């Protein structure tokens, strides 16, 4: 049985991921770019990580 009570945990535990992740994107606003923080909240992305590899060479 216990998987069935645990699926009822996971579909709530992942609903929390959506809410908190939307709060991270929404919190990464104009005044994060004023402070130059933004990329630390949302993480580095392919076209800039790729650029850092050209600087590595």
């Amino acid at each position: 049985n216990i998987t069935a009570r645990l699926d009822r945990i996971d579909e709530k535990l992942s609903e929390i991921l959506g809410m908190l992740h939307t709060l991270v994107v929404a919190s990464a606003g104009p005044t994060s770019a004023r402070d130059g923080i933004r990329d630390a909240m949302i993480g580095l992305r392919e076209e800039m990580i790729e650029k850092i590899r050209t600087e590595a060479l």
């Binding site: 609903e15 991921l17 939307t22 994107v25 104009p30």
Partner: protein, 1361 residues
Amino acid sequence: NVYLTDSYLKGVISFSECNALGSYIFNGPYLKNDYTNLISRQNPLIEHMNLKKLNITQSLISKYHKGEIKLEEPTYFQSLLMTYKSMTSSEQIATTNLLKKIIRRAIEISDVKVYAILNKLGLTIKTTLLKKLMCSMQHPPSWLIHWFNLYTKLNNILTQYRSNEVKNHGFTLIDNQTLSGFQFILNQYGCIVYHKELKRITVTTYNQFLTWKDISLSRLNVCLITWISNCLNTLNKSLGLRCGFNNVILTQLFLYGDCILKLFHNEGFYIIKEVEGFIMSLILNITEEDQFRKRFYNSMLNNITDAANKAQKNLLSRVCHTLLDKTVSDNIINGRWIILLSKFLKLIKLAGDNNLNNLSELYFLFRIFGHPMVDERQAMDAVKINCNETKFYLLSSLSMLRGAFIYRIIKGFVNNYNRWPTLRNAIVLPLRWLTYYKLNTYPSLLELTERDLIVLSGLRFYREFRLPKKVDLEMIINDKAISPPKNLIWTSFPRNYMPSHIQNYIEHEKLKFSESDKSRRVLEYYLRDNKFNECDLYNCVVNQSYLNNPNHVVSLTGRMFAMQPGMFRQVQILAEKMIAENILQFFPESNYISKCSIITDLSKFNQAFRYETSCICSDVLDELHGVQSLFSWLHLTIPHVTIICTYRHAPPYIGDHIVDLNNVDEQSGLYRYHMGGIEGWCQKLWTIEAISLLDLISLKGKFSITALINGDNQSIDISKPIRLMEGQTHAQADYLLALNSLKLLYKEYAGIGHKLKGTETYISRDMQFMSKTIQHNGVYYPASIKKVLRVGPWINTILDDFKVSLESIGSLTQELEYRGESLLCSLIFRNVWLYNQIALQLKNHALCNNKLYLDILKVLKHLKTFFNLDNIDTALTLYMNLPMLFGGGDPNLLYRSFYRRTPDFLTEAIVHSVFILSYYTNHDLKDKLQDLSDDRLNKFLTCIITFDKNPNAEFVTLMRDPQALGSERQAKITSEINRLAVTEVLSTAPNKIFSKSAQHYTTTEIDLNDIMQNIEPTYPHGLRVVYESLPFYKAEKIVNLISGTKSITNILEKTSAIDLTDIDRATEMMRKNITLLIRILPLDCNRDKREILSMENLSITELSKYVRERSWSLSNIVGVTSPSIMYTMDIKYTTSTISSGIIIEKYNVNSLTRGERGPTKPWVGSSTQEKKTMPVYNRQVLTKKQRDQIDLLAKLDWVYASIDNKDEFMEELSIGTLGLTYEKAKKLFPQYLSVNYLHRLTVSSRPCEFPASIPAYRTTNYHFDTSPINRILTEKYGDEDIDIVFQNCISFGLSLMSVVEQFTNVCPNRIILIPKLNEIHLMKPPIFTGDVDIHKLKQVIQKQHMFLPDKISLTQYVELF
């Protein structure tokens, strides 16, 4: 050096110019007490000193301070000009006799096209139809003569200005003789009007004089169209337009609408904007059920009176301490204006007649009252309140919006690419979503749950789309202005309006900015950039160099248009382009099923989006393109930025020794902290937010939804399955759904902070208002007249170009025929405005004086002797009818009255000339062509065949236009004359990427000829595929754009002036293009041909083939030579013993069929696709800019499969434009299954689809059947392809079914179309014997290098498979 001033309103009526000018002229605050009036009085502008110092206006100002004359605001003078009638007994005779002549010559010109058509359809004036019309239109009505008289006087005051201001600079026209009792002083920089009998004066911008001229034109055109229509509808009740206006009620409707603009001043346009509101309600009152019409009408009478209260409250606010203080009427303060407004709306109601045809065309009434002087500061003061405001969201309503966007993207990839977008965050999901991911499918919206649109919001992606690593110069360059950077922003204000510490600051800041940044137009920003390279957009985008940047302003200018410095304009255009290339494919909306429609308007819709409500979805796009902050640039950057009204006459007050405007104090017209939502920018992005959010509303409401969005409107149609309670009717259930779902749409838009007010949204059952046009029962109720209004002498030109004016009068006067469904009302209205533009307005051209008219006088004298005509006026009847391709006067060939596109223009230019010559030569167009006792048609064709062969550069000219003839046998387009003038300029531009190209361009134009010259059977559309593949095409688009500016020789010398060098070349072009008809039809025994053309057994498509070949001296030209459907089809009305042809039949029941709908699917006629297989590769890995280069290369692989050298030709192309070896690129090419690239190929030079010269809805009345033709076409041509398009054989049928009704007042039950088989030739694909010049191919690619689409790196090729 010369300035040429505008001929029509373009841009805006500048309020702060009228204020700045009038406030200085009178030395007191004129339109408003805001800062422009104070600075214009402190330190006047030299452009205005030169007005005030005139010995006339210095007298008027002395008379004003003596108090004998009274000061008024320009909408007062709009009413005085429009409700003016004056007659001298000779003056009213002359203005009548001129309009009687213009009408007589327009009917005597139109007669030859009607005699051509009525003789074809077998149905001083010849056709008795126009002879009856000429008896009817013989006396013009007094309400029309008054609008033509005022138009002629305001056009004369303007043409007497513009032609003198070309002849000498700084000229101010002073005129009290032309329009009676008025005195105008008129200048490029300002206007003054005085009325002596009424003792009143106005001061206004030049653009307002253009506006009174264009209002008098707009009303002249409404009275011409509706008088022509009312005379046509007196002869046959189906021959004129759809509507049925009574004109005295139109002329009162105009004079009442100017009289509300007299009362309410400039603020009266707030009420005129709600004419849309009232006309929508009269439409809804006819068509909708009670619960919808009663509700709309009540919500509309709220809008009209909130706008009149707002007009009064604003008017009495601004006027308070101005010189206008005593100029607002007792009818405002006592409220009697409600009576006037009731008379105005009671006139709209009476004009609309409860007839849905009047009420769709009566949208012209929106445009016919002039334009508001838009206060360039108040339009910001009323918007900062919406954009500084804090917004509150539930974290659930954010999450469900981000999740709805991600759901549309997962549904997007799974539809298009058979995959999910690759996830960095898949470990978020629950098992019943991991199952959808691993099976690569999705829940449908009925399977979807609002808890699902939470857990989907938590996903993050991996990079699937890619940014172009080079600037697309054609996306990024356009003619229009741009803002200086922040520290130079003060250069947008005229130097006298700036304090000393700005003047002597900016003259030391120009010394630390590059020549690009100073330039303040987009062209010059690029052309001056001597450190440009193609990567330097991408290399700022991934580097985030727009975040917190010290050069940033947003500059607002004349409805506000918003612009910013070039580095940010690039980021905006790229952020908008990548959504268009890659994301719009996911959002293509860009017991009883109770049914509802809701409509919403997106004027406010930008100002509502803060960061948190649009960056959430934009961060999904920043993930998918792999870049931080590209699509979210707008809200991340602009909050840090001061927003300035930078209109020239609208400076801020600047405190002493402030120079950096992030430290200028906020004020009317300058503010900070705009929390995103700039107008037009990110419009494609917020359309993705609207469509996303609507698929969350549809989940919460548990109803099916369909959405359509374009520009400023969204339209939504909703179905909910419901079980009906007793006594409830379908209409009552539809209205309850509309209210339950409107309640939900308001709730969820407020749930994303977008407050809504019922002015912008309304509910309906089945009435729709897409694309400004009205559909009821799926019948099109056109807005035709609203398009036509501004038709007149110099429209849409540069340098008042005679050829572009003629073509654009033609282009607009088609809307009476393609939407308005009346051919003869298009002809007569067009032949008024063409006869006026030729026989009257060429006597006083701005640049040329008599010289263009003296050159028509020799063309007419030449036509007279060539055709043995009896008078120079009837030589003009002929000039006005034969086509522009032969240097004639007629812009709309007789083919395009039946099908909107032809595969060949020349055969239609020849057939149009054949048909018209029947008028003079008394041929019959139904019969086979024959000998007759005059040669004049044969003699015309003899001069079309027989000319001296002077081909030059005969391949590159067929590359750049596959239809073209050359050998000086066609009129020369603005682009081909000016390409040398542009390249001689660009070869002096500091930008290397333009300079090296333009230095080599005139040698690349030789190599791009000599590449192909050896290949034997020339196929012009195949040449065009080679042309569009080679890098020279993107380099040519730039030259072709820049060749269409005014002032070409002066582009990068910073003047609005035009160099006399360009007046000389434009005069050379116009004077050759007019006289062309004396070179095309020489008198010289027709190149000594003492036998004139035998037209017994002649085929007009074979003559057209021989001429296009002779004109190049090419031995064979292939594929372009397709026949004229209108000449091959004989038309008959009963099936004889022939039992053959294409049969078109009425499936509608009744005898008339205009304005009624049939049982058949509608028709647009679509051309059998270039049948191909797409190979298995990761499609999204390749940018559109090279994914279309692969299809051009694939076209060359199957078109030119047969050449002597296919392998080297594709190798040096593929190593050039793709950067791959041929056998490794061949994997990516579509493989083409169709046999015959002559009959089925796609390129810009070949029509994609072939609509009929009928509105689409009406095609439903008819059914079409080609079975009887297919017998003779199969077994005269051996089941092989034939040089014809059946799509135009059908579209000619469906339009002939409409035009035959209009002329006879019955829609005939059946028509049969029988081919003249002489016009039909086998379309066999040839072996392209000959060798491509592979060195000349390499030279084109090398000299061009900078313009190449990006090369496929092996880094990109492995990922692509």
